[PDB]
Structures are given as structure tokens and as C-alpha cells.
Design a protein around this ligand. Structure first.
Ligand SMILES: *P(=O)(O)CC(=O)[C@H](C)[C@@H](O)CC
Ligand SMILES: *P(=O)(O)CC(=O)[C@H](C)[C@@H](O)CC
Ligand SMILES: [Mg+2]
Lengths: 280, 275
């Protein structure tokens, strides 16, 4: 439902996912924007998706950072969150610009979006230490948020969980598997991706390609898929997700998509074990 | 209407017409295309809009321009001044017509139009006519007819052309151009037609094979479309060494909007001189 989705479908069909994402990014510049975190069109109130034991003092809460995928939304963390029930509080925070009302305004810049989320999270979490968690584009967003919280809000997270991140220096698998990634996005549709949400996705992709100098002091858990998403020539190097100097690395069953789709308990299990290790 | 129109409207507000046209061009790459003149999804049969007296007298062929808000009505006001004087045919621009396939390149579109024009005109000499982007297209078609179809037209009428190397005034006035498109809307510009417009704008910025030998009538607006400092030079439309130059009242838009009879009069006088 919309020209942009028809164009996107054709671009994937023609193996030009990367070229089309640049088009979405350029076109997104002409969507109405918010320039201050106060001027955000949506209420970014996190949703509590799992509850920890009533038992509840100085214990870290999980914050799921919604990813960039235009087919995403409130359903993203439902499978993963069930594995945190009776273990940890799990809050899912929306990503600004993906909402309806009257479509949501897009952030003028990434810091503006991060500030809006940071405020929402600090209000919701109260005094509890926060561990940020994201998958793919959301993993990249989780780190950027962690740095923003530390520098602009004096509130560095207790940790960051990065599920299958592909940061700017490790792009080759993204490029070699762009058809599978584009196909994965159509495969994951519950409804047709709207043009507004495809534009939001392009705007964030471009934000995340740009110069992001700061490194969070929070410790990092790197969670990596164990199965390749598609064919990969061995002499290219390692296809696996990467992060510079993680505190801990965990490997789980599944590929880039199925690690969360079919093997969410294994992801949750890695996170819980790691949180116990960093807390005492 | 569609998202592209909404984005375009904002781009014009932001004085970023040129940037958005580039977005439309890049996006048009992902529309279904035709790569052979025969593979054109649409019938390009010219429509007869005016009838001349009932001999080897030239017929006029209107070359439809690129504007996403244009189409069938483009030459209606002009054509009335040709009734009882000359036959006037309007040829559609491929990709504007389930939506029409876009040409893979300009030559493919030109070939489709050439073939349709040659069967409609028959024995008669053809004088091509276009306005603005359509003027640039009329010349490109004239060249393709001569090169590839062994049939140079008898003349070309260029109504306010701004060819590569001479486009500073239309770049400077791009906001007025964008505003003109929305003002000239009869229905909301579709996303498909906006994409066609970007694709053709890109074709016309590309390197072209050469110059037609057909004589040119250059028709220029007398009033500037926007602000212009005298010290900047001439803002007027340009063509290298035309056979004849005619200046008419109006601006880029109104020369056709309000002053079409003056354009027609210049064309009629010139056809008499070249015949
Ligand atoms: P992920 O969000 O599943 C895949 C990914 O990293 C894409 C290609 C980037 O656009 C996200 C910033
Ligand atoms: P005209 O079509 O009003 C403006 C013009 O000269 C065209 C769009 C060129 O700039 C592009 C071929
Ligand atoms: Mg390293």
C-alpha cells in the first residue's frame, strides 16, 4: 500500500536493497520533523512486557530498544520478553518517527531522538540501573543511546546487550546478504510496510552510517548468531556479528533473523547469565 | 494523494526543487521499464487537436513536456489558434499513461514517438513544437528522426528552451517552477507521473549525440518568472543561432497560459517563410 513499498519490493527483487535505502534516506529529508525532544509528536512511554520477582532493590531493569526495521513495532520483543518473566523487568521503548495518530514527525537528528527516548526511560525506570538491549539496527541504536545517557543525562547504563550488530567497519556481510535482508523484511511483515515507516527506516539507516564519535563506558554483551544468513566466501573473513572490545561474547542458535524468531530463549538465557555475573 | 507528491510539496516550500527532482530520478530506477520501442506498454497515437484547410503543407506536432501535472490538455489553448490554418497533432510522452512502463533510456522513448509520428503524418512534412522541457525533447526527437529514421523534420519550434549550459535562470527560479506545477494541477499529481518527470529530467541532463539540421524558431517569454539582477546577465530562454527568434508577451508559464495566440501567430508567420 504505497509507491515506496512497491519500489522497495522491486529493488530487493533486482538485488539493489542498499541503493534503495539511500533513496529512502534522501527522500526522508522532506518529511515534517521535530527538532527538540520536547517537540516529539508521540508519547514514548515504555511498555512493561515482563516483570521481575516481587522479592526488587538495586536490580537492573532491561530496556528493549526498538530497531529500525519498517516492519517492526510493539510486537518486536514479545517472544524474547516472555523468557524474562519472573527474572527481570523488561521495558520496550518506541523509536520516534514510526508512530501513527497523522503520521509521526521524524527526528531532525539522531541525538534529538535519543534525548526523547532517554527522558522516557529515566522517568519509567526511576532509581533502577538500566541495561539497554537491541537487535541489529536496534543494537546500534542501543549503544548510541547508552552514550547519550552518559554524556547528556549523567546516567550511564549498567550494561548494553548488542544482539547481532554490524557496525560501520564490518559491513561486508550486510552487502553480501542484502537480498536476504530485504527479503527478511518482507518475510516479517504482519501488514504492508507503509511509506512513512520505510522513510523513517532510511532516515535512521543514514543516521547510523554517519560520524558517531563517542564510546559508551557501559560494559557490552555481544550476542552472535551461529548460522549464516546466506552463502559467504570463506576467504572474505568472518561473517559473524562484531563489536569492538565486548565485555562478554555469547553464541546462540539461529541466523540473524531466527536467533530472535525461533531461539529467543537462548538469547534471554545468555543475558540473564551475564547480568548475574556483572551484578555480583 | 501519494507520498511523493507530499514530499515534493514540502521540497518546494523548502526551496529544494532541484534536490527533490534528483530523488525522483533515482527512485524511477525501480519502476518497471521498457527497453525496446515496440515493448512500450502504451499506444502513442497522436491526437488531432486542430484542422487546417482541406499539398505538402507542414503539419505541426506538439511534443508533450515532462510536467507531472501535464498531459492531454497541454496544447489545447494553443491549438485553437491553429484551427483553419494547420493540422496540429499532440504526441504523448511515454511513461505517463496498472501504470505505464518507463523508458529505459531517452532514445527508446524517442523511437516510440518517432514511429507513431511517421504513421500519423504520412507524406506531410512535420514541424515539431515543444515548450520548456518539451522544447528540449522536441529537439532530441528531431535529431533521432534524422539520425535513426532518415526523416529530418521540416522545422522545430522551441518555446522557451533552457538547454544545458544556459539553465541558470530556471535553476534560480526553481521554486517558481515547483509552485507553477502545483498551481497548474487539475488533479493531484500522481506518484507514477512524478517519477516519470524525474526520470526524463535526468535523461535531458545527460550527454546527447548532437544537433538536428532542421531550422529552429526560438520563441521567448518577455517577462521574467522571478527576481533577477540586471548585472547577472540575460535571463531569457536560449538557443544557438536559431533561424528565427520571436518574442511574445508573458513569462515562462503565461506565454502559453495567457498569450498562446501570440505564440501561434509567430509560428504561422514562420511556417509561411520556411515554405
Ligand atoms: P538489521 O536491522 O536486521 C540489518 C541492518 O543492520 C540494516 C541493513 C541497517 O540498515 C540497520 C542500521
Ligand atoms: P519547464 O519544463 O517548465 C522547465 C525546464 O526547462 C525543464 C524541466 C528542464 O529543466 C529539465 C529538462
Ligand atoms: Mg575489534
Amino acid at each position: 500500500a504505497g509507491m515506496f513499498r512497491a519500489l522497495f519490493r522491486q529493488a530487493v527483487e533486482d538485488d539493489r536493497y542498499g541503493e534503495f535505502l539511500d533513496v529512502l534516506a534522501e527522500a526522508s529529508a522532506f518529511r515534517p520533523q521535530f527538532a527538540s525532544p520536547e517537540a516529539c509528536s508521540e508519547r514514548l512511554d515504555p511498555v512493561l512486557l515482563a516483570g521481575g520477582p516481587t522479592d526488587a532493590e538495586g536490580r537492573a531493569v532491561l530496556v528493549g530498544c526498538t530497531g529500525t526495521a519498517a516492519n517492526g513495532g510493539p510486537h518486536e520483543f514479545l517472544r524474547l520478553s516472555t523468557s524474562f518473566q519472573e527474572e527481570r523487568d523488561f521495558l520496550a521503548v518506541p523509536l520516534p518517527g514510526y508512530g501513527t495518530g497523522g503520521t509521526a514527525l521524524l527526528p531532525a537528528d539522531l541525538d534529538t531522538a535519543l534525548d526523547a527516548q532517554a527522558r522516557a526511560i529515566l522517568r519509567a525506570a526511576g532509581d533502577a540501573p538500566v541495561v539497554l538491549l537491541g537487535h541489529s539496527g536496534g543494537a546500534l541504536l542501543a549503544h548510541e543511546l547508552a552514550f547519550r545517557l552518559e554524556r547528556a543525562h549523567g546516567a550511564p547504563p549498567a550494561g548494553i546487550v548488542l544482539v547481532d550488530p554490524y557496525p560501520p567497519g564490518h559491513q561486508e556481510p550486510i552487502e553480501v546478504w542484502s537480498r536476504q535482508l530485504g527479503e527478511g523484511l518482507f518475510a516479517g511483515e504482519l501488514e504492508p510496510m507503509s511509506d512513512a515507516r520505510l522513510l523513517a527506516m532510511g532516515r535512521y539507516a543514514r543516521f547510523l552510517a554517519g560520524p558517531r564519535p563517542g564510546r559508551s563506558s557501559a560494559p557490552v554483551l555481544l550476542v552472535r548468531a551461529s548460522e549464516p544468513l546466506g552463502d559467504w566466501q570463506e576467504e572474505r573473513g568472518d561473517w559473524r556479528a562484531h563489536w569492538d572490545l565486548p565485555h562478554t561474547v555469547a553464541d546462540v542458535p539461529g541466523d540473524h533473523f531466527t536467533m530472535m524468531r525461533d531461539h529467543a530463549p537462548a538469547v534471554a538465557e545468555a543475558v540473564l547469565s551475564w547480568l548475574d555475573a556483572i551484578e555480583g
